[PDB]
Design a protein around this ligand. Structure first.
Ligand code: NA
Lengths: 141, 141
């Protein structure tokens, strides 16, 4: 095809439960597409890397805000994230290790950053890395 | 979320007709997941860039083969790709321009490369660039 669909290419290791469902994927696309209506993509013929990076940030924040991830003080809902991991029903030994890294990643994020957006950015990066390590997940880049 | 779904972030410009449906997206995931059961991701502790690149090429080949995109000799079905563009029902001026590029991308691919896989790789990159330009499509990297 001249227009192939692009999908993630991931081996889930010990953690097949973390693979998004078709439904979860369709949900997220709807959120992102709505965010893009207000946050159009920068012109790649003209945009600077900084403009691209800050626009990307704005879309990630939009999707988290639209789906309820910040409280009335603007703080990311770390306890919601924890409960969502428990709801995946990982194998018990993996769950325990992931939930310990949740605490470690929340601590790292909150001690490094006072900015609530920087906190969630570092927490998500921290969990992407640590979940990948615990689970043996490989992602094609 | 500690495990957000990752989705394309694209503005489709003049060419919303090219956005994959949920069905098309789900089929491509099913094909890629089946391809990975035989074409495992290389271990980044050990993998060369050549091994990583050749593995990525194999997944693309695998998914194209699963969907019927090669004849029995191994040649990519360029005329199928051409007819699939016409069946998108783009605006007439857009279609005209995209089909001129299809023919020119095919001719470049076959003149530059004798390897059938190299031919489809060049054609798809050529069409990604040219369809994006004609349509005004922006894709977040
Ligand atoms: Na915990």
């Amino acid at each position: 095809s001249a227009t192939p669909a692009k999908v993630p290419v991931i081996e889930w290791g010990k953690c097949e439960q973390l693979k998004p469902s078709e439904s979860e994927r369709t949900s997220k696309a709807a959120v992102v597409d709505k965010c893009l209506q207000s946050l159009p993509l920068p012109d790649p013929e003209k945009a600077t890397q900084q403009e691209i990076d800050k626009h990307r940030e704005s879309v990630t924040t939009c999707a988290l805000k639209a789906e309820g991830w910040f409280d009335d003080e603007g703080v990311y809902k770390f306890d919601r994230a924890r409960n969502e991991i428990k709801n995946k029903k990982l194998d018990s030994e993996v769950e325990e290790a992931v939930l310990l890294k949740h605490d470690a990643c929340q601590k790292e994020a909150t001690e490094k950053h006072d900015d609530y957006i920087n906190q969630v950015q570092l927490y998500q990066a921290c969990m992407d890395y640590n979940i990948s390590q615990i689970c043996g997940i490989k992602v094609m880049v």
